[PDB]
Amino acid sequence: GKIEEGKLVIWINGDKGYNGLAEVGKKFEKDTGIKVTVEHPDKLEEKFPQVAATGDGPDIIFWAHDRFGGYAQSGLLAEITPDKAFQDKLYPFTWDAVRYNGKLIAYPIAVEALSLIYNKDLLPNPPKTWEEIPALDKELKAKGKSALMFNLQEPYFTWPLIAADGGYAFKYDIKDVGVDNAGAKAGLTFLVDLIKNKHMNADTDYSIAEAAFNKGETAMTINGPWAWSNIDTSKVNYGVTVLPTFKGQPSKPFVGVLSAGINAASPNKELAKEFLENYLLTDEGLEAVNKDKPLGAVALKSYEEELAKDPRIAATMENAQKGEIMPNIPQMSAFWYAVRTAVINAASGRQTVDEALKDAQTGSELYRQSLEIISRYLREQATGAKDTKPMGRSGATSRKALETLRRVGDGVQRNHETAFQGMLRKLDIKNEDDVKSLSRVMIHVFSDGVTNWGRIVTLISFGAFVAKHLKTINQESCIEPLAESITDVLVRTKRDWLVKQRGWDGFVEFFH
Ligand SMILES: COc1cc2c3c(cc(C(=O)O)n3CCCOCc3nn(C)cc3-c3c(Cl)ccc4c(CCCOc5cc(C)c(Cl)c(C)c5)c5n(c34)[C@H](C)CN2C5=O)c1OC
Ligand SMILES: OC[C@H]1O[C@H](O[C@H]2[C@H](O)[C@@H](O)[C@@H](O)O[C@@H]2CO)[C@H](O)[C@@H](O)[C@@H]1O
């Protein structure tokens, strides 16, 4: 073991009410004598997978639900089994946000959506459209002010505009990605044109936009409920309202459900359950957090009935209903990373909107595309017959890549039979547990050195060799897990190289 028994360590983002959470933890300690430590480390959503994979990390992690599926896919989250009485206290759709493969993998805390925050002393009537913001910025520049400033370094904040005219992440399946259609292009182009016409600055981040709004220098910002507290201390006469439309269409923020997941490696799962169910998700626990930094529309019905009277919460829910609940599928991280880079590169001029979004599309589709190819190859190699299913969207790439792989990988498997048999014997794979064990070994062997298509063909060809072995020892059910694991090792460790090669299209070109 590694996580200490007898206490609770919690991770929550630095923009949330961690002091109020610590107050709840101090009440928990007063009752039980169990010390609760709340930390807010930088990049905790990226740090948690790494440290939890090795059995460390916090007992409880707080984040929006979109990441948790990935954590659940990697075995890092304990299953949540609250009884009906407690489940009935929270809104069903918040439970739906934290369900993964039919299992509850977190407690939902609160519903978050971005709104347009505006300075009533500068803008008694905020703009209803994105399109009128350039003229409004000219009017405000005439008097020493600016129209709008918001964080351009995180794609969460730009996504409402990208999605307004038809951009989307995953259609409601990981095969259909819409970050590079005409609507996404139109939204990102509007943002880039705002920057080129000096209505916004490409370097603007969270701190810069927050400081400019709370000092009264800019008339609008885009942000979530957690920010209201600081504005309250600013004494700016502010309102919270619906996001402007773009091309006559509502802005569509990605809706997050702040949720608390229990580390699968924690020896304090019953303590964490008691704390979350009977201390935090109460009227007084949620209030203690909310008084620090507002949570949004909390999942607890009794408290949300009080919070819903707040016009700021009504606007939050109006924008949420115009938006969409985030998926929790494990590729969300990759998606976000891709879009993050796109927005930044588009805003700085390092790429055009077309180039940036094409790269984002490649990055977002990489997992499913690689998985389709590798799975089909491994299954047809192990059984001697091919999958009859249609290739689907971007199916030309998958078909062509599978043909290329058939050629090159049967060459590799013929030539490298001795080393392959040796490593297969040295690994000794017998069941589903050893295949789940294979991933750290795979990362080690696939590590350092050069990255080329031939090494990837070697990875996949040895995967096919192992799939053949699994078929022989009557373990066909292990082939699809194996394939998945291989995919995860490939797309994660070689993400940037793969995107630079245009992905499997570059694979196909290289061996043409
Ligand atoms: C140190 O840096 C490296 C290492 C490697 C390189 C290159 C460049 C190329 C290339 O140009 O093709 N290769 C592949 C050469 C194939 O060598 C055959 C070879 N011999 N022995 C003595 C053992 C091997 C050997 C074997 Cl049996 C099987 C797979 C590999 C791989 C793929 C990564 C790991 O996969 C998987 C691993 C596991 C546990 C599982 Cl369950 C699955 C499902 C997949 C590599 N290997 C392999 C050798 C070490 C070279 N290797 C590799 O990645 C490189 O850069 C300078
Ligand atoms: O920008 C990508 C980022 O978006 C969302 O993160 C939000 C988070 O949900 C909010 O609670 C608040 O903290 O702002 C974050 C943006 O900086 C996704 O939840 C996250 O996974 C993703 O990386």
Author numbering: -196 to -25, -19 to 320
Source paper text:
The B cell lymphoma 2 (Bcl-2) family of proteins are key regulators of intrinsic apoptosis. The antiapoptotic protein myeloid cell leukemia 1 (Mcl-1), which is associated with high tumor grade, poor survival, and resistance to treatment, has emerged as a promising candidate for treating hematological and solid cancers. The binding interaction is driven by the four hydrophobic residues (L210, L213, V216, and V220 in Mcl-1) in the conserved BH3 domain which bind to four corresponding hydrophobic pockets (P1-4) on the antiapoptotic members. ,− To achieve potent cellular efficacy, Mcl-1 inhibitors require exceptionally low binding affinities (subnanomolar). Herein, we report the structure-guided design of small molecule macrocyclic Mcl-1 inhibitors based on the (R)-methyl-dihydropyrazinoindolone scaffold our group has previously disclosed.
To understand the binding interactions of the macrocyclic inhibitors, the X-ray cocrystal structure of 13 bound to Mcl-1 was obtained. The X-ray crystal structure of 13 confirms our expectations that the single macrocyclic diastereomer produced cyclizes from the top face, avoiding the steric clash with the lactam (R)-methyl group on the opposite face. The introduction of the 5-atom tether results in an ∼8° shift in the dihedral angle between the core indole and the pyrazole ring, with the tethered pyrazole substituent of 13 angled toward nitrogen of the indole carboxylic acid. There is also a slight repositioning of the Mcl-1 loop portion, with the loop region positioned further away from the indole 5-position substituent in the cocrystal structure of 13 as compared to 9. In the cocrystal structure of 13, as well as each other macrocyclic cocrystal structure we have obtained, the oxygen atom of the tether is positioned away from the surface of Mcl-1, presumably to avoid a repulsive interaction with Thr266. Compound 13 also maintained high selectivity (>50,000-fold) for Mcl-1 over other antiapoptotic Bcl-2 family members Bcl-2 and Bcl-xL. Compound 13 was evaluated in a NSCLC A427-derived xenograft model, where it induced tumor regression as a single agent.
